Amino acid sequence: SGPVPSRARVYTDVNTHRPREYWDYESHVVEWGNQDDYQLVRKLGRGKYSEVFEAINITNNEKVVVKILKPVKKKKIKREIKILENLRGGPNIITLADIVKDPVSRTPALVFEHVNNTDFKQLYQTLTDYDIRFYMYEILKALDYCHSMGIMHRDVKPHNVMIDHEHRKLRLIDWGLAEFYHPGQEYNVRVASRYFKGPELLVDYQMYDYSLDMWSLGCMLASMIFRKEPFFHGHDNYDQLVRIAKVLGTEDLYDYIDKYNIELDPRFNDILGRHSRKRWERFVHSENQHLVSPEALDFLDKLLRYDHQSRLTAREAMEHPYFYPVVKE
Ligand SMILES: Nc1ncnc2c1ncn2[C@@H]1O[C@H](COP(=O)(O)OP(=O)(O)NP(=O)(O)O)[C@@H](O)[C@H]1O
Ligand SMILES: [Cl-]
Numbered sequence: 104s105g106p107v108p109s110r111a112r113v114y115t116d117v118n119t120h121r122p123r124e125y126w127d128y129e130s131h132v133v134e135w136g137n138q139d140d141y142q143l144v145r146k147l148g149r150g151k152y153s154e155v156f157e158a159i160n161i162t163n164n165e166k167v168v169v170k171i172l173k174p175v176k177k178k179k180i181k182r183e184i185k186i187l188e189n190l191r192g193g194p195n196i197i198t199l200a201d202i203v204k205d206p207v208s209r210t211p212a213l214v215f216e217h218v219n220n221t222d223f224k225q226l227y228q229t230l231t232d233y234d235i236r237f238y239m240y241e242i243l244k245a246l247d248y249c250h251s252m253g254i255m256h257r258d259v260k261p262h263n264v265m266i267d268h269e270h271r272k273l274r275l276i277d278w279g280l281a282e283f284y285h286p287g288q289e290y291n292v293r294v295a296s297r298y299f300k301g302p303e304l305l306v307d308y309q310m311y312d313y314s315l316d317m318w319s320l321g322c323m324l325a326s327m328i329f330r331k332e333p334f335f336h337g338h339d340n341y342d343q344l345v346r347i348a349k350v351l352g353t354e355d356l357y358d359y360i361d362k363y364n365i366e367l368d369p370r371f372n373d374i375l376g377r378h379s380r381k382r383w384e385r386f387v388h389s390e391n392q393h394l395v396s397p398e399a400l401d402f403l404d405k406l407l408r409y410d411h412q413s414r415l416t417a418r419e420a421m422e423h424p425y426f427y428p429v430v431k432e
């Protein structure tokens with residue numbers, strides 16, 4: 104029969120109305136600087152795609168961050184570069200300062216504006232009800248901007264959100280999985296972290312859109328207000344959907360699959376079963392009560408939906424009552 108097609112509710116055709124060069128990143132030509140302008144101070148951690156260092160720009164003694172890219176396809180490098188260049192100047196978006204190459208190993212490296220992020224492992228337990236609202240609103244600014252620019256982040260999670268609590272600055276980072284949205288394109292579903300993967304990724308629905316980022320944001324919010332990280336703690340991609348099913352119920356899930364005529368992997372058959380949609384009060388207790396409110400739960404409910412078309416858009420979210428104390432200030 105074949106899966107039912109899907110289009111984005113908002114910002115659907117923004118890339119079509121732009122010059123080819125804007126989104127055709129394969130044909131983008133990179134202008135390199137010299138990595139001798141920078142000296143590495145210390146490593147700030149690693150990943151599967153890069154090693155990240157704090158560094159100094161010897162030309163003006165300013166602190167920067169160098170992200171040396173582990174050998175991936177040139178395409179994926181040009182993509183991250185083109186997207187960062189397109190998103191430059193945007194609200195709460197990380198700034199790409201320069202692009203360099205090691206003279207010896209010819210390994211490409213990205214230079215970013217420095218951000219002094221206090222670790223979320225120690226931060227998300229020191230945040231007040233307002234702070235959560237405030238920073239969530241900041242991320243939404245970033246998401247709305249990049250979506251309006253025709254870009255899906257596809258990797259929204261606490262590790263990719265750098266926060267300077269002292270100056271109350273927030274920067275969304277890691278755009279290595281980011282991609283341009285085109286109506287009717289079927290994307291790779293194997294992106295983002297397991298705990299933040301949307302249902303469309305778990306059931307292998309390729310024609311997704313910006314709303315994927317909104318699910319991930321809901322997962323973040325849930326873990327923050329309930330003090331449960333991660334909120335959906337699955338053992339793998341299949342048990343991850345099961346973990347979700349025990350909360351959002353199985354009824355809406357099977358309706359979602361039916362609406363888009365999704366072919367569900369035979370492996371899910373025996374492991375999903377039947378589960379009711381739980382009320383959010385179940386996850387509330389004395390430890391997190393001060394962060395939970397009727398508005399917080401109403402907002403959270405509108406992000407965590409199986410149907411990606413049924414989730415709030417970034418702009419809609421910013422207009423939710425949950426952010427009234429932030430907008431008033
Ligand atoms: N601009 C920055 N300023 C300060 N620290 C940063 C900056 N960018 C990245 N980091 C740190 O480096 C880590 C990983 O950087 P990241 O850009 O996500 O590379 P990555 O390989 O794409 N990570 P991931 O794809 O999620 O496995 C982050 O968790 C931060 O701690
Ligand atoms: Cl149950």
Ligand SMILES: [Mg+2]
Nearest residue numbers: 150262263277
């Ligand atoms: Mg990252």
Ligand SMILES: [Mg+2]
Nearest residue numbers: 152277279280
């Ligand atoms: Mg990455």
